[PDB]
Design a protein around this ligand. Structure first.
Ligand SMILES: CCCCCCCCCCCCCCCC(=O)OC[C@H](COP(=O)(O)O)OC(=O)CCCCCCCCCCCCCCC
Ligand SMILES: CCCCCCCCCCCCCCCC(=O)OC[C@H](COP(=O)(O)O)OC(=O)CCCCCCCCCCCCCCC
Ligand SMILES: CC(C)CCC[C@@H](C)[C@H]1CC[C@H]2[C@@H]3CC=C4C[C@@H](OC(=O)CCC(=O)O)CC[C@]4(C)[C@H]3CC[C@]12C
Ligand code: NA
Ligand code: NA
Lengths: 568, 153, 48, 90
């Protein structure tokens, strides 16, 4: 009677081949059917549900999936729970991790977790004023409920558009209608506020409680002039590229050093917050550790190069591991890493944001493929090194005293393993030549076998694997491009909500019971009109089926036999 | 024409990448500029028979990383005359990661991007086409039919 | 002894799935139409 | 197989010789949905990870350390089962 959602379960509550696993209690099945009336009729009987954790094996995982399947219903969360939003968040998290633990039954616990996320999102859809929405999003058990929603990765909850209007009004404070303006006026405000980061950052150091000290406290006036400041730092790195063994630092480098110290003090300031859990899980903070670690290595090798290197030797006489050349090389790599941080600024823009986050979600599917390709690289480099290691020639024997590839004469590519891996890397692009696979000793069989090995590497790597990577990114990009614009808005609210905190000053160098009664008063209304909207949607959207046909057939049949029994 | 606007959103990001690697390679190789007299045929930079100073200035480095998307640079570009094997190796690894990012990652992401855009565009085609065909047709309905083959004067 | 139980609850699950997942069609409409029509002519033949 | 509601029933199914006879017949007749059914995958996973209480519960760094440290000991685990097959290491 509970399966068919009949409310003739009042008779069965008033007064061998079970078609169920015998773990099933009536409230588990009532929650599996998601009918609010039967769940209320059984919760009013004061029945309980077991807790899943533990100290022959199909009954245990089947019973745990029944318990989590009953707890994840949006009517046992709407009833019998203090607040359904935290319950939907914590159940969505426990079902997501529980899907990641158990390789079997993964597609069902993920379905239950998406049910728990969709429930909380549909609770925000029922807020019909902004007092209710501010009571929801500020409820501390600041914006506490959004911090918990981002903490439990509730992407549909945060990307709900009423929440995006509230975050947009918190974001654009001090701007009456920024989105109403034309984009040329937007560009002029971005540029003119961009030039004034010393004029807005000297204030809040001398006069914090002033008309200008409260103007950098605005988060959109944080984002602009934190990032135009970063464009001035990258402008100093562009300026820096325009003999003494270890020189004193250039006037450009003296200008750059406190930008660098502001970055390192900023990242240590972020590693003090929390721990190495949220910091190391974020890829851009790992890129900050690589960039700033190369800054510490570069400045440290400038200090080491200044110590006891007093003379001046010409450039072409230096050793290979001279710390001046290493400091310049690591400075160049840190310029690539510092100049690729502007990709993370794309999430603030509505055009470049979902594109950038879709590319970031396809990179993890490329990295599953580069392992297989690197195995192929190891295979053919093993074979070609094994065939051509007999034919190493000294660097004196070739013109211009040049060995390997990166010569005008590509001479010994398959000689060592390191040069063979390098050789098969550069042949993916059209940068090797066929004279590479020759030897001086004119052995036509081994040169032919080596050219066939190089040819099958070209077929496997360029025709097979590259186009399989193309088809792989088509099928991944189609899956990613549906969940885009809520995947984008989650990262945009993380970027926005990073600028709401207390530590306003830039890295340019400047760097150096009533609430619960109101919340239950809102939650009661949201649950009531939520459940009314869901029974309304079940009346509109449920298509008719065969058992509904049998109900009409028995009504006409039973009324037929009753009239025939009265008239007979 | 409706996919060009989706390419132009991507060339900004790619130009961001070129800027990054040109900053790094100019920063590493700006110490090794040679005068044009020192090379044969008095030729400097790329667009020479001997590709000699590509990562010397910033404009020539942006040019250099532009021409390496196609198979038109060479590996002898990343050398210096002074035989510094560590900086030539680091510069060749920077050029290699530019080739992986630009040619393997970003180009094929542009391919998948234009697949997913072309599927959306190809449904609204033939009413998107007929609107522009009626704009082209309805441009020739007006009184000003005088011919621009100079008969227009 | 196991196969008998699996067949029995399998067939019960399949008739259950045929009751839930089969959409209504025109012949099911003709069955209701003949039930109301036949009950109509039967009541009119008792009251006439 | 979806209707098996215990593991005694599932072990009676998958061991029925006309060892795992019914899985050998299922792989022999290329029954890919039969074998990939998740209760069968739990039984094959417990037969696979015997001597491991909850391998999937462990973190992948601990997984990597067990893979490496068991990986180095293939003479220390393969000299046993040649000298002492019926032993704690054999
Ligand atoms: C969204 C913005 C962009 C996204 C960022 C993209 C993610 C990064 C992608 C990986 C990073 C590049 C790897 C470094 C390249 C490099 O090693 O650079 C290769 C260097 C360059 O040649 P040198 O020997 O002269 O240095 O070679 C070596 O240092 C020796 C090791 C060679 C082994 C490399 C194996 C990796 C190959 C992966 C690509 C294969 C192509 C695929 C064909 C189907
Ligand atoms: C999943 C992991 C990877 C999957 C494995 C991939 C499957 C293997 C694919 C085929 C194996 C490579 C074939 C050997 C290459 C070779 O012959 O190597 C070619 C050799 C190399 O040249 P040499 O004459 O110098 O040796 O040439 C010859 O020996 C003469 C015969 C040439 C005729 C070859 C015709 C085959 C062409 C197939 C590829 C064409 C490209 C497609 C363009 C659209
Ligand atoms: C042309 C090539 C060489 C790249 C140019 C380098 C920079 C000048 C570009 C690259 C990306 C651009 C950024 C892309 C996106 C944004 C967000 C953008 O903000 C918005 O789109 C709206 C913000 C909001 O309303 O929340 C303004 C600055 C910024 C960082 C842009 C600043 C200029 C950047 C850093
Ligand atoms: Na950071
Ligand atoms: Na090419």
């Amino acid at each position: 009677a509970i399966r068919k959602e009949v409310v003739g379960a009042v008779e069965l509550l008033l007064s061998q081949f079970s078609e169920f696993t015998p773990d099933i209690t009536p409230i588990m099945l009532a929650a599996h059917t998601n009918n609010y009336e039967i769940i209320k009729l059984l919760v009013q009987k004061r029945v309980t549900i077991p807790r899943p954790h533990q100290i022959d094996s199909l009954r245990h995982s089947r019973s745990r999936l029944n318990i989590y399947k009953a707890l994840a219903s949006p009517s046992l969360i709407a009833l019998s729970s203090e607040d359904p939003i935290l319950t939907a968040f914590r159940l969505g998290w426990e079902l997501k991790e529980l899907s990641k633990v158990e390789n079997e039954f993964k597609a069902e616990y993920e379905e239950l977790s998406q049910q728990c996320k969709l429930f909380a999102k549909d609770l925000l859809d029922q807020a019909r004023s902004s007092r209710e929405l501010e009571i929801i999003l500020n409820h501390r058990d600041d914006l506490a409920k959004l911090k918990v929603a981002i903490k439990y990765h509730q992407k549909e909850f945060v990307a709900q558009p009423n929440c995006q209007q509230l975050l947009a009004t918190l974001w654009y404070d001090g701007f009456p209608g920024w989105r109403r303006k034309h984009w040329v006026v937007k560009l002029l405000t971005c540029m003119t506020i961009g030039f004034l980061f010393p004029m807005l950052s000297i204030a809040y150091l001398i006069s914090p409680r002033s008309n200008l000290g409260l103007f950098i406290k605005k988060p959109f006036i944080k984002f602009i002039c934190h990032t135009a400041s970063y464009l001035t730092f990258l402008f100093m790195l562009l300026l820096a590229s325009q003999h003494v063994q270890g020189p004193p630092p250039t006037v450009v480098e003296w200008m750059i050093l406190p930008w660098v110290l502001g970055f390192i003090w900023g990242e240590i300031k972020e590693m003090w917050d929390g721990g190495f859990t949220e910091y190391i899980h974020d890829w851009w903070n790992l890129m900050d550790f690589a960039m700033n670690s190369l800054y510490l290595a570069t400045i440290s090798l400038k200090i080491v190069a200044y110590v006891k290197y007093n003379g001046s030797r010409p450039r072409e006489e230096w050793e290979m591991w001279h710390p001046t050349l290493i400091a310049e090389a690591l400075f160049a790599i840190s310029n690539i890493l510092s100049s690729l941080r502007l990709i993370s600024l794309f999430t603030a823009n509505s055009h470049l944001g979902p594109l950038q986050i879709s590319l970031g979600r396809m990179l993890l599917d490329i990295l599953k493929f580069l392992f297989i390709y690197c195995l192929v690289l190891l295979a053919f480099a093993n074979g070609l090194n094994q065939l051509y290691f007999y034919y190493e020639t000294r660097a004196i024997d070739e013109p211009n005293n040049c060995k390997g590839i990166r010569c005008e004469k590509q001479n010994n590519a398959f000689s060592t393993l390191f040069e063979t891996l390098q050789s098969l890397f550069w042949s993916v692009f059209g940068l090797l030549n066929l004279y590479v696979t020759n030897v001086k000793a004119r052995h036509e069989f081994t040169e032919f076998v080596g050219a066939t090995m190089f040819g099958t590497y070209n077929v496997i790597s360029l025709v097979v694997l590259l186009n399989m990577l193309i088809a792989m990114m088509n099928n991944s990009y189609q899956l990613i491009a549906d969940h885009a614009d809520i995947e984008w808005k989650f990262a945009r609210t993380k970027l926005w909500m990073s600028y709401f905190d207390e530590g306003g000053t830039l890295p340019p160098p400047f760097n150096i019971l009533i609430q619960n009664q109101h919340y239950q008063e809102v939650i009661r209304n949201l649950v009531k009109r939520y459940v009314a909207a869901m029974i309304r949607n079940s009346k509109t959207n449920e298509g008719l089926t065969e058992e509904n046909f049998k109900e009409l057939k028995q009504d006409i049949s039973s009324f037929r036999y009753e009239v025939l029994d009265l008239l007979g």
